[PDB]
């Protein structure tokens, strides 16, 4: 379906092989976990990031 959103602003790693990407970034929610937090990917390599760094496409 749908599972893409538009990074908020930028996200720097912070966890052990945790997700990293910048504003514009098109994360690929692989599977909504965590309520402030899931698991997606980006930068040809997926991990967890902020849920709300990043924001819907669609609408």
Same mark, same amino acid.
């Given at each position: 379906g749908s599972?893409?959103?538009?990074?908020?602003? =930028?996200?720097?790693?912070? !966890? =052990? *092989? !945790?997700? *990293?990407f910048r504003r514009g970034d098109f994360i690929h929610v692989m599977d909504n976990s965590d309520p402030n937090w899931w698991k997606g990917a980006c930068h040809g390599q997926t991990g967890m990031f902020p849920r709300n760094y990043v924001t819907p496409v669609n609408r």
């Open positions: 599972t893409y959103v538009q990074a908020l602003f =930028d996200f720097d790693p912070q !966890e =052990d *092989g !945790e997700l *990293g």
